[PDB]
């Protein structure tokens, strides 16, 4: 087509979606990771994760307001990945990289799994 | 912080949100613009438009599944702006610029109003 494109649009949309999350505006699901609860927007979770895409396209699961993750999932790892979904920034540290990578494999977030593998290889 | 950032994340999120819209997945509102109907995600509309942000933060309107726009709004202008919200690309043409600018003023989409004003000034 002959469209023009606003470079910062996608980043500005994501910043506003994170502001809605902060303010608990139109959040429509609670993700439970053992004793912790995280509120989010189903559409953002599906846009970032192959696991959430599969969950919320299922005719029965699409209607659930609570999703319980596998008990082996680390809540801090999940929190770091949820923040990445809404900001593009990943708080990857020596003390959390194994939990973050394991969580990203489970959630099916291939670009995160890729940077974790590279950071681990560099330390070996 | 000491975060790393994935450059293409926000663009990839927006592309996936547009794929959900295409496929009518988790759309939760119908916007009526006279005889036409447009399905969308409330969160994407709020993230892009000051008018939708005000509508869906209202304690009564947040619960509506149908929103009727002012009868003066042009459906093609709205369609072009809805496509911009989900893609960052604006199909601005000599034959539609006046309707697009009027719609962007109503929806409170300041960056679009800005490029329309500039394109109009260039033709004068």
């Amino acid at each position: 087509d002959s469209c023009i494109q606003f470079t910062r649009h996608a980043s500005d949309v994501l910043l506003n979606l994170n502001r809605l999350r902060s303010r608990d505006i139109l959040t429509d699901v609670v993700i439970v990771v053992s004793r912790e609860q995280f509120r989010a927007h189903k559409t953002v979770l599906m846009a970032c994760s192959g696991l959430f895409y599969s969950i919320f396209t299922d005719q029965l699961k699409c209607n659930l307001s609570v999703i319980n993750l596998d008990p082996e999932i680390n809540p801090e790892g999940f929190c770091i990945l949820l923040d990445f979904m809404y900001t593009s920034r990943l708080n990857l540290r020596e003390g959390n990289i194994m939990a973050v990578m394991a969580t990203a494999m489970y959630l099916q977030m291939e670009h995160v799994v890729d940077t974790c593998r590279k950071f681990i290889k560099a330390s070996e | 912080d000491s975060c790393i950032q994935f450059t293409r994340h926000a663009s990839d999120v927006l592309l996936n949100l547009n794929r959900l819209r295409s496929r009518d997945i988790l759309t939760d509102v119908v916007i009526v613009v006279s005889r036409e109907q447009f399905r969308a995600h409330k969160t994407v509309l709020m993230a892009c438009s000051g008018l939708f942000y005000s509508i869906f933060t209202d304690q009564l309107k947040c619960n509506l599944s149908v929103i009727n726009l002012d009868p003066e709004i042009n459906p093609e202008g709205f369609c072009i702006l809805l496509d911009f919200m989900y893609t960052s690309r604006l199909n601005l043409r000599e034959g539609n610029i006046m309707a697009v600018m009027a719609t962007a003023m109503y929806l409170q989409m300041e960056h679009v109003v800005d490029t329309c004003r500039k394109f109009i000034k260039a033709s004068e």
Binding site: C3, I4, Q5, T7 | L90, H111, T115
Partner: peptide, 4 residues
């Protein structure tokens, strides 16, 4: 704004 740019030409994509």
């Amino acid at each position: 704004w740019v030409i994509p």
